Amino acid sequence: ESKKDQEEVFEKPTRETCQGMRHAIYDKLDDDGLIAPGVRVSGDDVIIGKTVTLTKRDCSTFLRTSETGIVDQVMVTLNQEGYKFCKIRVRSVRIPQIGDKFASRHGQKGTCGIQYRQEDMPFTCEGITPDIIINPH
Amino acid sequence: KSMESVMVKYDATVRNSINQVVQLRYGEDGLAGESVEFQNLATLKPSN
Amino acid sequence: RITTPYMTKYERARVLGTRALQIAMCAPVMPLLIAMKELKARKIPIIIRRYLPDGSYEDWGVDELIIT
Amino acid sequence: EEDASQLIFPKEFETAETLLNSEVHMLLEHRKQQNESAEDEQELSEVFMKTLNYTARFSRFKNRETIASVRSLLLQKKLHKFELACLANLCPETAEESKALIPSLEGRFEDEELQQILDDIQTKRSFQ
Amino acid sequence: YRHLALLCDTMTCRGHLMAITGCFDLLLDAEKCKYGM
Amino acid sequence: MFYHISLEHEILLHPRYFLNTVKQKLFTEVEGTCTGKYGFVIAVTTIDNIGAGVIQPGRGFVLYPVKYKAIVFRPFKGEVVDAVVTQVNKVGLFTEIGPMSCFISRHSIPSEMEFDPNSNPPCYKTMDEDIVIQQDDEIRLKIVGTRVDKNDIFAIGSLMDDYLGLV
Amino acid sequence: RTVITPDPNLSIDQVGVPRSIAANMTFAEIVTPFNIDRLQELVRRGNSQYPGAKYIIRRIDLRFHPKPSDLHLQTGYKVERHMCDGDIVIFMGHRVRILPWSTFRLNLEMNLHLPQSLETRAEIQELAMVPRM
């Protein structure tokens, strides 16, 4: 937040009083314009509803990359100068899909080709089915 | 960028952007690149 | 008559690339697989205009020519 | 720079020929002959319709050789075709009125040649 | 060898060595186009 | 003015109609254009050649360069033509030389012929009451310059020389 | 733009584009008597499901407020569907088979460019398919 004189404050934009914005629904925003932790944000919905006061212009800060995680923590402090501040930590798990890159301690970085089943992974004489098969070559 | 537009025109000469003749027949006999093999002659090599 | 009596592979890209275009645009049939059959049965209403590097040209039709 | 009495007719206009209101009259009805064939067709332009009435009233000659002979007696003439438009549609009957309706005839052919040949045109006019 | 006789023949075209740093057309055949449904 | 000359033009066929189709789309398109190079287009009499149909690179439109004879109608500077009386005003006169209209400006209007509101069409008259302009008369007017308006040309009629006025 | 991953069960001139990527690209199709009875399903679904279309060049943005007065489709129009199988994309020229994850499978990153006409498609087909080079 920076007051300057066009200044801006944390708030909640109603759709038909603030200017240009997408169809990012403002359900998740609270009474003052911050998301409380424990509210699952989807791809591209408003997390901080900041408005340069002009009628007013619109300066939302979208969730980039459309990851669909969970907002985990919000702190509200002052800056160096005396202006209110906020940091937000949107967490997401990431299950290892096809693609995510693995490597041992012995060079030879590799991908993940296909994910088989315990059903299908070749079993030993004693019911061991290895987690990972690397190429001989 | 040296051979950016050296082509084979319908004379089967070898011509380019500045429309000058590079070669009169393409590759010294007109034959094409990817339809030849290695063969031997057997009149050159043996004795008299 | 100094041009080659066959069809070069660049004509066949531009014959069938355009003959299938007009058949897509509501023409009389004589889209891509339609024009493959017409060339290999030799029924196409296109005359190829081959220039020469002097400035001249020679106008060939497909039935005058040996297709691949 | 150009003017039709200054006679700047370029090479885009040098091959041209004036047409009478009667020479247009024998041809637009040949245009309508192609319209009466393939009947109940989408009709001709309204500019043609305004031209249809402009070649209707002002037909200064009627018979097929009458339109031709006045053209051919003036094709024997060495005066310009634009100045001829006046000689057979505007029709001065005297050489003085010919020099008055066309005041760009100065420094040119004689009065008697501009009188006698125009009075030959006045003999064969299709009056009605 | 055909890829060596073109590097050797674009430098030495102009008599001295230097460093470095669709022809056809189509026509619609209307006589064939009259017949054919 | 009528002149029968050569004209060069090309027709853009859509592939819905794949010779005689071309000739009847020809008379639709470019009969009646306002060209500063040749004028109005009256009619086409003769057609030289049905040219070779060149397919454009892409977009499927074949194109036929067709050469043809046609009657032009251009306004020409310095042109006295008899026209038809249609409207008379102290501002001017709006008369058609066939299909092409014309204007007669106040600098060229005679100050002798005064305005005549006595006839049921407004006109100019004399004090002799024998020369009174009626409907469908012949007026002589020079074409002094082409003033093109709404992408259409009306001529500038002049009445300041020999016989320029009423017949 | 995403990873390539190996996959020996595709005939060489094939690529596996996943459904989060082929549902953004378009191949603008022009209506024939063939597809006019086929594409109306793909107009009807819209942008909600995967086999749908974005634009109808009659230019109606058919992704929100569908307006069923303007679901007309006669020949000559241009419809911009998302993707299907069998279509041709550029590196050589692959062919889209759909294998649902997040990686471009091809029988041995890269972007993906898609041509937009039935002429420059067949230039790739008879000159630059993956077997042809």
XYZ file of C-alpha atoms in Angstrom:
718
model
C 0.000 0.000 0.000
C 1.338 3.428 -0.922
C -0.360 6.741 -0.305
C 1.040 9.465 -2.529
C -2.149 12.551 -5.302
C -3.509 9.229 -6.535
C -3.346 6.895 -3.543
C -4.523 3.332 -3.019
C -5.923 1.371 -0.089
C -6.809 -2.264 0.560
C -10.535 -2.737 0.050
C -13.133 -4.922 -1.633
C -14.182 -3.848 -5.146
C -17.844 -4.071 -5.941
C -18.102 -4.879 -9.642
C -20.185 -1.872 -10.744
C -18.279 0.859 -8.906
C -14.682 -0.022 -9.878
C -13.170 -0.161 -13.349
C -11.618 -2.956 -15.441
C -11.442 -6.461 -14.015
C -11.972 -10.006 -15.210
C -14.672 -12.480 -14.184
C -12.768 -13.325 -11.004
C -15.528 -13.635 -8.430
C -14.974 -11.726 -5.189
C -16.379 -14.371 -2.839
C -13.063 -15.189 -1.203
C -12.262 -11.605 -0.226
C -13.121 -10.665 3.330
C -14.472 -7.441 4.863
C -11.250 -5.545 4.071
C -9.717 -7.129 0.963
C -7.511 -9.954 2.207
C -8.162 -13.680 2.091
C -8.360 -15.420 5.438
C -6.140 -18.524 5.607
C -7.901 -21.764 4.873
C -9.815 -20.635 1.769
C -9.040 -22.650 -1.337
C -8.226 -20.302 -4.192
C -8.706 -21.556 -7.722
C -6.930 -20.475 -10.869
C -7.111 -16.689 -11.374
C -9.261 -15.280 -8.590
C -8.585 -12.077 -6.694
C -6.358 -12.333 -3.639
C -5.719 -8.643 -2.844
C -8.317 -6.162 -4.034
C -6.200 -3.047 -4.319
C -7.711 0.044 -5.953
C -5.845 3.111 -7.162
C -8.363 5.790 -6.206
C -9.442 7.856 -9.207
C -14.602 5.921 -10.990
C -11.704 4.151 -9.305
C -9.127 2.131 -11.201
C -8.527 -1.534 -10.447
C -5.272 -3.219 -9.390
C -6.097 -6.775 -8.313
C -3.220 -9.211 -7.789
C -4.156 -12.536 -9.315
C -2.988 -16.001 -8.413
C -0.558 -16.639 -11.229
C 0.046 -20.059 -12.887
C -3.533 -21.261 -12.037
C -2.212 -23.795 -9.550
C -5.385 -24.075 -7.376
C -3.822 -24.288 -3.925
C -4.763 -23.192 -0.414
C -4.089 -19.804 1.142
C -2.153 -20.691 4.251
C -1.135 -17.533 6.124
C -1.649 -13.753 5.931
C 0.375 -11.206 7.918
C -0.411 -7.478 8.066
C 2.338 -5.051 9.116
C 3.738 -1.615 8.396
C 6.419 -0.918 5.821
C 9.668 0.955 6.465
C 7.756 4.238 6.155
C 4.438 3.772 7.939
C 2.273 2.248 5.232
C 0.286 -0.940 5.775
C 1.666 -4.100 4.181
C 0.636 -7.697 3.594
C 2.337 -10.973 2.684
C 0.392 -14.100 1.645
C 1.576 -17.714 1.400
C -0.552 -19.772 -0.997
C 0.458 -23.407 -0.618
C -0.118 -26.303 -2.996
C 0.808 -29.962 -2.839
C 2.451 -31.495 -5.849
C 1.978 -35.247 -6.324
C 4.664 -36.566 -8.737
C 2.885 -36.789 -12.125
C 4.294 -37.946 -15.420
C 7.002 -35.421 -16.165
C 8.519 -34.377 -12.866
C 12.260 -34.774 -13.021
C 14.287 -37.078 -10.730
C 17.994 -37.676 -10.318
C 20.225 -39.808 -8.131
C 23.470 -38.760 -6.481
C 25.300 -40.332 -9.436
C 24.557 -37.978 -12.296
C 22.065 -39.068 -14.919
C 19.043 -36.802 -14.475
C 15.809 -38.450 -15.588
C 12.111 -37.871 -16.220
C 9.056 -39.904 -15.199
C 7.622 -41.860 -18.100
C 4.554 -43.785 -16.936
C 3.106 -44.686 -13.546
C 2.302 -48.379 -13.305
C 0.646 -50.259 -10.492
C 1.761 -52.571 -7.710
C -0.502 -54.856 -9.714
C 1.862 -54.405 -12.704
C 5.327 -53.681 -11.308
C 7.472 -56.821 -11.543
C 7.510 -58.618 -8.234
C 10.407 -60.508 -6.632
C 10.190 -63.961 -5.085
C 9.097 -62.202 -1.863
C 6.568 -59.572 -2.933
C 8.878 -56.612 -3.543
C 7.880 -54.397 -6.473
C 10.508 -51.715 -7.138
C 9.567 -48.064 -6.942
C 11.569 -46.986 -9.987
C 12.973 -48.714 -13.077
C 15.924 -47.060 -14.797
C 17.216 -47.981 -18.208
C 20.209 -50.315 -18.603
C 21.784 -48.279 -21.402
C 22.761 -17.273 -45.213
C 25.356 -18.069 -47.857
C 23.057 -20.537 -49.641
C 19.819 -18.875 -48.674
C 18.036 -19.191 -52.021
C 20.267 -21.138 -54.427
C 17.740 -23.322 -56.246
C 17.152 -25.555 -59.258
C 15.189 -23.775 -61.970
C 13.388 -25.501 -64.836
C 16.417 -25.521 -67.087
C 17.853 -27.790 -64.374
C 20.630 -25.278 -64.062
C 21.592 -23.936 -60.642
C 20.369 -20.387 -60.133
C 19.822 -18.141 -57.135
C 18.428 -14.794 -55.970
C 20.706 -12.618 -58.067
C 19.649 -14.686 -61.024
C 23.093 -15.911 -62.080
C 24.025 -19.414 -63.202
C 25.986 -21.250 -60.526
C 26.091 -24.664 -62.196
C 24.742 -25.692 -65.575
C 23.734 -29.169 -64.444
C 23.058 -29.874 -60.812
C 25.948 -31.682 -59.186
C 27.835 -32.215 -62.467
C 25.365 -34.734 -63.874
C 21.901 -33.420 -62.970
C 21.145 -36.464 -60.776
C 19.548 -35.973 -57.392
C 21.030 -36.403 -53.971
C 19.056 -39.035 -52.107
C 18.615 -41.590 -54.883
C 22.172 -42.836 -55.499
C 24.324 -45.624 -54.031
C 27.928 -46.824 -54.084
C 28.777 -49.208 -56.931
C 31.920 -50.628 -58.545
C 33.082 -50.644 -62.143
C 35.140 -53.875 -62.612
C 36.750 -52.654 -65.841
C 38.919 -50.085 -64.090
C 40.341 -52.264 -61.347
C 41.385 -55.619 -62.970
C 44.517 -56.255 -64.977
C 45.071 -56.477 -68.712
C 8.798 -28.126 -74.326
C 12.034 -28.228 -72.330
C 10.350 -28.862 -68.986
C 10.305 -32.235 -67.308
C 7.572 -34.705 -68.352
C 6.874 -35.716 -64.722
C 5.303 -33.895 -61.784
C 7.740 -32.469 -59.303
C 6.827 -32.957 -55.657
C 6.296 -29.211 -55.204
C 3.530 -29.022 -57.817
C 1.709 -31.889 -56.091
C 1.792 -29.954 -52.829
C 0.300 -26.897 -54.521
C -2.137 -28.745 -56.806
C -3.666 -30.852 -54.040
C -3.296 -28.080 -51.487
C -5.521 -25.821 -53.565
C -7.779 -28.326 -55.309
C -8.852 -29.547 -51.884
C -9.325 -25.900 -50.893
C -11.898 -25.201 -53.604
C -13.678 -28.509 -52.983
C -13.962 -27.341 -49.382
C -15.528 -24.126 -50.730
C -18.471 -25.736 -52.601
C -17.082 -26.532 -56.037
C -18.167 -29.269 -58.472
C -16.519 -32.562 -57.581
C -15.015 -34.451 -60.494
C -11.663 -32.386 -48.816
C -8.032 -33.542 -48.739
C -8.833 -37.192 -49.435
C -11.230 -36.095 -52.173
C -8.499 -34.489 -54.257
C -6.052 -37.384 -53.750
C -8.489 -39.676 -55.564
C -9.038 -37.163 -58.368
C -5.342 -36.782 -59.173
C -4.667 -40.511 -59.020
C -7.620 -40.997 -61.372
C -6.492 -37.898 -63.353
C -9.577 -35.671 -63.150
C -8.503 -32.148 -62.123
C -9.432 -28.773 -63.734
C -6.017 -27.148 -63.221
C -3.387 -26.186 -65.825
C 0.111 -25.843 -64.370
C 1.964 -22.624 -65.320
C 5.724 -23.349 -65.307
C 7.928 -20.333 -66.027
C 11.457 -20.476 -67.293
C 14.350 -18.346 -65.968
C 14.438 -16.266 -69.160
C 10.965 -14.849 -68.508
C 8.950 -17.196 -70.694
C 6.577 -19.931 -69.591
C 5.060 -23.233 -70.597
C 1.489 -24.249 -69.823
C 1.011 -27.906 -68.949
C -2.060 -29.864 -67.987
C -2.069 -32.941 -65.818
C -3.254 -35.462 -68.430
C -0.358 -34.346 -70.635
C 1.911 -35.316 -67.747
C 3.027 -38.418 -65.864
C 1.960 -38.348 -62.231
C 3.847 -40.074 -59.438
C -3.929 22.056 -68.415
C -6.561 20.208 -70.436
C -9.765 21.538 -71.988
C -12.016 20.010 -74.622
C -11.781 23.169 -76.735
C -8.019 23.216 -76.128
C -8.239 19.642 -77.474
C -6.027 17.760 -75.015
C -7.328 14.280 -75.801
C -4.672 11.860 -74.486
C -3.669 8.380 -75.649
C -6.325 7.011 -73.291
C -8.815 9.037 -75.378
C -7.123 9.175 -78.798
C -8.729 5.976 -80.123
C -12.233 7.194 -79.262
C -15.252 8.215 -81.355
C -18.248 10.398 -80.568
C -21.678 8.798 -80.631
C -24.897 10.547 -81.543
C -28.075 10.324 -79.531
C -29.225 8.277 -82.548
C -26.083 6.111 -82.673
C -26.692 5.378 -78.994
C -30.381 4.845 -79.881
C -29.656 1.961 -82.252
C -27.403 0.304 -79.669
C -29.255 0.570 -76.349
C -32.246 -1.121 -77.949
C -29.798 -3.827 -78.987
C -28.833 -3.947 -75.302
C -32.512 -4.303 -74.390
C -32.806 -7.067 -77.002
C -30.448 -9.056 -74.766
C -32.741 -8.079 -71.863
C -36.000 -9.158 -73.536
C -34.229 -12.455 -74.093
C -33.735 -14.329 -70.815
C -36.951 -12.637 -69.759
C -38.116 -11.630 -66.255
C -34.481 -10.797 -65.491
C -33.121 -8.355 -62.927
C -33.439 -5.136 -64.863
C -30.798 -2.732 -66.107
C -29.176 0.124 -64.221
C -31.045 3.295 -63.351
C -28.180 5.216 -64.976
C -29.133 3.319 -68.145
C -32.755 4.352 -67.551
C -31.690 8.001 -67.412
C -29.639 7.340 -70.536
C -32.670 5.509 -71.991
C -34.636 8.751 -71.850
C -31.655 10.858 -72.960
C -31.245 8.900 -76.199
C -35.037 8.811 -76.620
C -35.961 12.474 -77.124
C -32.734 13.796 -78.636
C -32.579 11.360 -81.589
C -31.741 13.867 -84.316
C -31.719 11.181 -87.038
C -34.018 8.192 -87.489
C -33.325 5.953 -90.499
C -30.423 3.494 -90.511
C -28.626 5.075 -93.462
C -29.598 8.575 -92.260
C -27.630 8.069 -89.039
C -24.874 6.476 -91.129
C -24.600 8.983 -93.998
C -24.364 12.058 -91.751
C -21.712 10.153 -89.800
C -19.980 9.135 -93.042
C -20.175 12.583 -94.638
C -18.649 13.902 -91.411
C -16.144 11.039 -91.424
C -14.960 12.594 -94.693
C -14.482 15.845 -92.747
C -11.170 16.871 -91.204
C -12.796 18.629 -88.246
C -12.478 16.916 -84.884
C -15.066 14.477 -83.558
C -15.688 16.553 -80.411
C -16.403 19.583 -82.584
C -18.567 17.226 -84.663
C -20.758 16.440 -81.652
C -22.024 19.976 -82.161
C -22.337 19.587 -85.939
C -24.938 16.794 -85.744
C -26.588 17.032 -82.299
C -26.415 20.752 -81.530
C -26.763 21.402 -85.316
C -25.777 24.931 -86.392
C -27.376 25.494 -89.778
C -24.954 28.274 -90.788
C -21.170 28.553 -90.700
C -21.381 31.717 -88.590
C -23.440 29.900 -85.956
C -20.934 27.063 -86.365
C -18.187 29.530 -85.450
C -20.441 30.910 -82.696
C -21.531 27.633 -81.097
C -17.926 26.477 -81.560
C -15.707 29.535 -80.915
C -12.645 27.250 -81.068
C -12.877 27.080 -84.890
C -10.584 30.094 -85.247
C -7.373 29.771 -87.234
C -8.845 26.831 -89.156
C -10.726 25.905 -92.352
C -12.624 28.253 -94.660
C -16.119 29.633 -94.131
C -17.523 28.207 -97.375
C -16.258 24.716 -96.561
C -17.838 25.173 -93.120
C -21.010 26.397 -94.881
C -21.480 24.105 -97.899
C -20.802 20.814 -96.126
C -23.004 21.703 -93.147
C -25.792 22.668 -95.559
C -25.443 19.172 -97.028
C -26.069 17.794 -93.529
C -29.180 20.006 -93.226
C -30.673 18.383 -96.335
C -30.855 14.820 -94.952
C -32.139 15.427 -91.399
C -34.933 13.231 -90.013
C -37.285 15.955 -88.827
C -40.522 15.102 -87.034
C 30.109 -34.715 -53.058
C 27.174 -32.624 -54.304
C 27.318 -30.693 -51.044
C 30.962 -29.827 -51.671
C 30.455 -28.674 -55.255
C 28.113 -25.982 -54.036
C 30.289 -24.490 -51.333
C 33.171 -24.483 -53.808
C 30.892 -22.880 -56.414
C 29.340 -20.009 -54.535
C 32.568 -18.508 -53.251
C 34.412 -18.674 -56.582
C 31.538 -17.496 -58.750
C 32.705 -13.898 -59.148
C 36.273 -14.863 -60.075
C 37.645 -14.026 -56.628
C 37.179 -15.505 -53.180
C 34.881 -13.846 -50.669
C 33.653 -14.528 -47.136
C 30.025 -14.936 -46.049
C 29.399 -12.720 -42.977
C 7.771 -20.741 -55.850
C 8.780 -20.143 -59.450
C 5.741 -21.704 -61.111
C 2.050 -20.769 -60.994
C -1.344 -22.355 -61.646
C -4.229 -21.849 -64.061
C -7.828 -23.051 -63.910
C -8.842 -25.313 -66.799
C -12.377 -24.259 -67.710
C -12.777 -26.734 -70.585
C -12.471 -29.614 -68.128
C -14.580 -27.598 -65.676
C -17.654 -27.448 -67.946
C -18.399 -31.144 -67.508
C -18.270 -32.862 -64.156
C -21.135 -32.585 -61.694
C -19.929 12.362 -73.606
C -20.194 9.007 -75.387
C -16.935 7.396 -76.549
C -16.363 3.708 -77.287
C -12.864 2.600 -76.219
C -10.959 -0.306 -74.662
C -11.044 -1.083 -70.947
C -8.957 -3.491 -68.875
C -10.609 -5.261 -65.952
C -10.341 -8.414 -63.817
C -13.141 -10.473 -62.246
C -12.824 -12.137 -58.840
C -14.718 -15.428 -59.018
C -15.691 -17.190 -55.840
C -15.551 -20.990 -56.225
C -19.327 -21.401 -55.905
C -19.508 -21.084 -59.698
C -17.022 -23.502 -61.209
C -17.137 -18.974 -68.821
C -20.694 -17.803 -69.356
C -21.022 -17.328 -65.605
C -18.213 -14.753 -65.816
C -19.822 -12.678 -68.561
C -23.055 -12.098 -66.632
C -21.173 -11.267 -63.426
C -19.168 -8.818 -65.550
C -22.115 -6.539 -66.343
C -23.135 -6.482 -62.671
C -19.868 -5.223 -61.193
C -18.322 -2.383 -63.188
C -21.065 -0.860 -65.313
C -21.644 2.521 -63.683
C -18.460 3.543 -61.872
C -17.368 7.137 -61.223
C -13.788 7.133 -62.505
C -11.605 10.212 -62.694
C -9.696 8.346 -65.403
C -12.589 7.436 -67.735
C -15.950 8.564 -66.262
C -19.319 6.841 -66.102
C -19.717 3.466 -67.819
C -22.640 3.278 -70.235
C -22.617 -0.254 -71.667
C -20.332 -3.009 -72.930
C -20.527 -3.833 -76.634
C -17.450 -5.945 -77.419
C -15.284 -8.233 -75.260
C -11.773 -8.967 -76.536
C -10.736 -12.108 -74.689
C -11.712 -14.341 -71.795
C -8.237 -14.491 -70.291
C -6.518 -17.290 -68.441
C -7.922 -17.980 -65.007
C -5.095 -17.398 -62.545
C -5.565 -18.967 -59.121
C -4.325 -16.631 -56.417
C -1.808 -17.955 -53.876
C -4.193 -19.043 -51.172
C -7.835 -18.049 -50.631
C -9.237 -19.901 -53.664
C -10.283 -16.906 -55.778
C -9.457 -17.562 -59.401
C -9.085 -14.348 -61.361
C -10.017 -13.693 -64.993
C -8.364 -10.772 -66.792
C -11.018 -9.933 -69.387
C -10.410 -7.229 -71.997
C -13.456 -5.505 -73.392
C -14.831 -2.509 -75.275
C -17.258 -0.178 -73.523
C -18.882 3.232 -73.917
C -17.438 5.702 -71.425
C -19.208 8.818 -70.167
C -16.853 11.330 -68.672
C -17.354 15.035 -68.003
C -14.921 17.098 -70.068
C -13.776 20.665 -69.418
C -15.229 23.002 -72.059
C -18.339 21.124 -73.190
C -21.562 22.746 -74.441
C -24.416 20.207 -74.387
C -28.158 20.804 -74.629
C -29.835 19.609 -71.434
C -33.329 19.536 -69.892
C -34.829 22.201 -67.610
C -35.657 20.684 -64.216
C -35.338 23.407 -61.546
C -34.592 27.151 -61.613
C -33.372 29.128 -58.586
C -31.367 32.288 -57.937
C -28.818 29.983 -56.285
C -28.632 27.828 -59.399
C -30.171 25.155 -61.604
C -30.070 21.394 -60.938
C -30.315 19.888 -64.435
C -29.303 16.409 -65.609
C -27.270 15.929 -68.786
C -28.880 12.549 -69.215
C -27.714 10.688 -66.116
C -25.105 13.261 -65.020
C -26.420 16.337 -63.209
C -25.203 19.926 -63.564
C -25.129 23.284 -61.784
C -25.386 26.828 -63.193
C -23.672 29.312 -60.884
C -24.641 32.931 -60.182
C -21.480 34.258 -61.866
C -22.715 32.600 -65.080
C -26.491 33.164 -64.650
C -27.772 36.048 -66.824
C -28.837 39.131 -64.905
C -31.134 39.985 -67.830
C -33.281 36.864 -67.380
C -34.973 37.631 -64.066
C -36.694 35.073 -61.864
C -40.229 34.087 -62.907
C -42.655 32.994 -60.156
C -45.643 33.498 -62.500
C -45.321 30.167 -64.299
C -46.278 27.066 -62.327
C -42.719 25.767 -62.710
C -40.297 28.473 -61.547
C -38.106 29.659 -64.398
C -36.373 32.653 -65.955
C -38.299 34.951 -68.276
C -38.016 38.022 -70.477
C -39.896 41.293 -70.295
C -41.175 40.544 -73.817
C -43.209 37.612 -72.336
C -42.439 35.484 -75.420
C -39.291 33.704 -74.223
C -40.497 31.923 -71.072
C -38.768 28.739 -69.928
C -41.161 25.801 -69.632
C -40.673 22.178 -68.617
C -38.433 19.990 -70.829
C -36.662 22.706 -72.813
C -33.133 22.844 -74.220
C -30.506 24.952 -72.431
C -26.910 25.446 -73.590
C -24.245 25.121 -70.899
C -20.459 24.820 -70.981
C -18.760 22.324 -68.676
C -16.246 24.654 -67.046
C -15.068 22.304 -64.301
C -15.906 19.051 -62.577
C -17.013 19.456 -58.952
C -17.310 15.892 -57.666
C -19.745 15.442 -54.769
C -20.771 12.356 -52.741
C -18.284 10.538 -55.035
C -20.304 11.676 -58.055
C -19.656 14.467 -60.541
C -21.969 17.335 -61.413
C -20.854 19.769 -64.102
C -20.701 23.563 -63.892
C -22.986 25.104 -66.516
C -22.073 28.498 -67.953
C -24.343 30.993 -69.736
C -21.978 33.840 -70.682
C -21.129 33.518 -74.406
C -22.747 33.011 -77.839
C -26.209 31.368 -77.737
C -25.792 30.200 -74.129
C -29.311 30.412 -72.738
C -32.585 29.150 -74.201
C -33.109 27.988 -77.790
C 5.177 -25.168 -24.075
C 5.968 -28.259 -22.012
C 8.169 -31.315 -21.674
C 8.587 -34.120 -24.170
C 8.400 -37.639 -22.678
C 9.097 -40.915 -24.502
C 6.301 -43.187 -25.602
C 6.892 -46.154 -27.947
C 3.186 -46.791 -28.667
C 2.671 -44.065 -31.253
C 3.222 -44.456 -34.987
C 6.220 -42.190 -35.532
C 4.362 -39.276 -37.085
C 2.321 -38.756 -33.910
C 2.408 -36.573 -30.799
C 0.442 -36.781 -27.596
C -0.998 -33.399 -26.810
C -2.756 -33.362 -23.444
C -6.243 -31.967 -22.983
C -5.163 -28.883 -21.084
C -3.215 -27.722 -24.141
C -5.309 -28.864 -27.094
C -8.255 -27.084 -25.425
C -6.647 -23.701 -26.094
C -5.414 -24.103 -29.667
C -7.778 -23.831 -32.646
C -7.990 -25.054 -36.247
C -10.397 -22.751 -38.088
C -12.602 -25.065 -40.144
C -14.628 -23.911 -43.165
C -18.030 -25.518 -43.613
C -18.663 -28.170 -46.304
C -21.761 -30.370 -46.812
C -19.714 -33.018 -44.960
C -19.134 -31.246 -41.666
C -22.286 -29.088 -41.519
C -24.086 -32.013 -39.906
C -21.045 -32.703 -37.713
C -20.002 -29.291 -36.423
C -23.411 -28.360 -34.992
C -22.765 -30.647 -32.034
C -19.440 -28.850 -31.594
C -21.237 -25.510 -31.734
C -23.873 -26.739 -29.274
C -21.421 -27.688 -26.523
C -19.467 -24.442 -26.520
C -16.354 -23.901 -24.422
C -17.500 -25.891 -21.373
C -16.643 -29.388 -22.557
C -13.507 -30.276 -24.425
C -14.827 -31.095 -27.921
C -16.268 -27.669 -28.626
C -15.445 -24.429 -30.437
C -14.503 -20.863 -29.587
C -15.527 -18.548 -32.425
C -18.108 -18.688 -35.199
C -17.054 -16.553 -38.164
C -20.476 -15.993 -39.696
C -17.404 -13.385 -35.141
C -19.422 -14.542 -32.134
C -17.418 -15.244 -28.983
C -19.095 -18.575 -28.185
C -17.711 -19.132 -24.719
C -20.061 -17.068 -22.513
C -23.741 -16.118 -23.024
C -24.288 -18.498 -25.962
C -27.334 -16.621 -27.445
C -29.179 -19.482 -29.233
C -30.623 -17.104 -31.840
C -27.115 -17.054 -33.365
C -26.473 -20.804 -33.535
C -26.988 -20.766 -37.296
C -24.592 -22.715 -39.498
C -24.753 -22.723 -43.298
C -21.922 -23.543 -45.694
C -19.260 -20.928 -46.241
C -18.939 -20.089 -42.540
C -15.765 -20.553 -40.521
C -15.903 -22.399 -37.197
C -12.884 -22.516 -34.859
C -13.047 -25.816 -32.996
C -10.482 -26.703 -30.339
C -8.760 -29.876 -31.617
C -9.403 -33.515 -32.446
C -7.257 -36.451 -33.357
C -5.686 -36.756 -36.786
C -4.876 -33.060 -37.259
C -1.363 -31.974 -38.280
C 0.904 -29.744 -36.168
C 4.469 -28.508 -36.711
C 7.784 -29.474 -35.032
C 8.531 -31.667 -39.447
C 4.859 -32.413 -39.079
C 3.442 -34.580 -36.312
C -0.157 -35.724 -35.891
C -2.228 -35.087 -32.788
C -3.268 -38.130 -30.760
C -4.682 -37.274 -27.338
C -3.148 -38.872 -24.230
C -4.429 -37.185 -21.092
C -1.774 -35.817 -18.663
C 0.557 -32.804 -18.922
C 3.357 -33.968 -21.315
C 3.918 -34.150 -25.093
C 4.503 -37.815 -25.756
C 6.312 -38.662 -28.923
C 7.968 -41.848 -30.155
C 11.642 -40.950 -30.410
C 10.912 -28.815 -24.249
C 9.159 -27.844 -27.464
C 6.483 -25.325 -28.406
C 3.648 -26.221 -30.744
C 2.607 -24.274 -33.836
C -0.575 -25.077 -35.779
C -1.219 -23.962 -39.385
C -4.549 -22.398 -40.270
C -5.487 -23.507 -43.802
C -6.156 -26.575 -45.936
C -3.377 -25.522 -48.326
C -0.500 -25.022 -45.921
C -1.605 -28.176 -44.141
C -1.076 -30.265 -47.267
C 2.233 -28.555 -47.963
C 3.370 -30.123 -44.713
C 1.750 -33.452 -45.576
C 3.441 -34.120 -48.908
C 6.760 -32.532 -48.071
C 7.456 -32.562 -44.354
C 5.794 -35.345 -42.488
C 8.020 -37.112 -39.960
C 8.626 -40.153 -42.233
C 9.297 -37.882 -45.192
C 12.349 -36.348 -43.518
